[PDB]
Amino acid sequence: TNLCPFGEVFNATRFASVYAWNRKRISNCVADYSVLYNSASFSTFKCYGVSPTKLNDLCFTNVYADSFVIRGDEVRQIAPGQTGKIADYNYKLPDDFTGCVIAWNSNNLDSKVGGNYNYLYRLFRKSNLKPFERDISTEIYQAGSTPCNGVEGFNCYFPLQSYGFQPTNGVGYQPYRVVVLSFELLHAPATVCGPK
């Protein structure tokens, strides 16, 4: 009967990197999705499966708010049926996706002048991620036929690389903060409701 922490997720001071993306389980609350749909902050709001208006009339078992940071060119890749470095190696969405994808520019927050090396993305991986999979492996990638045994060098690459966000880059290559809402419904008790 109390309010939902969506404010915790969106207005967070720090956001995780893409490969190590954070997930929040929202439950035992009642939430106003109107704040989200009627806001001018977002640059992208793509719901896949549900009308975000009309949402406050439903109830769900669990609503998951995933969150991370990618470059603006990658925001289109956060979607069912999509392919790219981000969709295959860092964060994948299922084809029968029931949810919404929100993104807004943050060049003023997440871009250091010399390069923000705290944001990473997985560039090497021998198999695409299954939907909703999360890989935090730091093991050196064996590109060659020769084993590396914990030492990087030629054909032995660290599997994560830095976006290196800087503010003078074009709008395309700037950090966008992304939230992904996921709605699930088992034949279990619904606890995430709306007003009235």
Partner: antibody
Framework: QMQLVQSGTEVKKPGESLKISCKGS????????IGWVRQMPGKGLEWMGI????????RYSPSFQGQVTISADKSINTAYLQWSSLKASDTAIYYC????????????WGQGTTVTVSS | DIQLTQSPDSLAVSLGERATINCKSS????????????LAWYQQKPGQPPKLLIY???TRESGVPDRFSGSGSGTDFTLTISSLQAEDVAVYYC?????????FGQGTKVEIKR
């Protein structure tokens, strides 16, 4: 809650270009996907395609791929549908419908644009 | 690419009686995650724009009267007008929104029988 408003009646000769519009006023518009429906005289409804204004992800129906072009302008909340060469068979009324998600019913509808193509 | 069929095409039924407008699909349209099925029922009177009446198989849009009901599951769905009033006479369409390409029915022309 928001509403949709389309352009006025059109009368062209066969072969001329045309680009009709559909603008949305109201709050909650960033989420709306806008689709186009064609209705020939006395016949049923045909879904042509859909677009999202924010990034112009545009999906056509198999019957209208390459026959029309659906575009958008997110700065003015306007979706567009244009023909390169109008055919006499394009005479119909064209609605723009809006669904607040991609797999979502069209709750909000435009008023309709009647297009008559004749020599 | 999801064929859709309504039944019948005319359906002249008297004032206050029940109207049964079928609709046949061609693919199970149950999103297993929410176990809801993605079909909508629209009403259009001549010269008017189509107004959405029923979202999902049974959920009803606001401002519509209690006589309209949606039913069905799997691939067979029905819209039923319980106590027909004259102010309801129009052409009715069903549409699926499982996936692009969206598809409508052929339409059922519903009139008052006298």
């Amino acid at each position: 809650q928001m509403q949709l408003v389309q352009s006025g009646t059109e009368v062209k000769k066969p072969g001329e270009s045309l680009k009709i519009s559909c603008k949305g006023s109201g709050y909650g518009f960033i989420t709306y996907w806008i689709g186009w429906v064609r209705q020939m005289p006395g016949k049923g409804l045909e879904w042509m395609g859909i677009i999202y204004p924010g990034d112009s992800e545009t999906r056509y129906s198999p019957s209208f791929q390459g026959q029309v072009t659906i575009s958008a302008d997110k700065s003015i909340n306007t979706a567009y549908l244009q023909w390169s060469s109008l055919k006499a068979s394009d005479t119909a009324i064209y609605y723009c419908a809006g669904g607040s998600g991609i797999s979502t019913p069209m709750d909000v509808w435009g008023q309709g644009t009647t297009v008559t193509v004749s020599s | 690419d999801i064929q859709l069929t309504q039944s019948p095409d005319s359906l002249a039924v008297s004032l206050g009686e029940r109207a049964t407008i079928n609709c046949k699909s061609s693919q199970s349209v149950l999103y297993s995650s929410i176990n809801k099925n993605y079909l909508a029922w629209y009403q259009q009177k001549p010269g008017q724009p189509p107004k959405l009446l029923i979202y999902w198989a049974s959920t009803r849009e606001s401002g519509v009267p209690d006589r309209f009901s949606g039913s069905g599951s799997g691939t067979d769905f029905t819209l039923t007008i319980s106590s027909l009033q004259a102010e309801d006479v129009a052409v009715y369409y069903c549409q699926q929104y499982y996936s692009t390409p969206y598809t409508f029915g052929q339409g059922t022309k519903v009139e008052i029988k006298r």
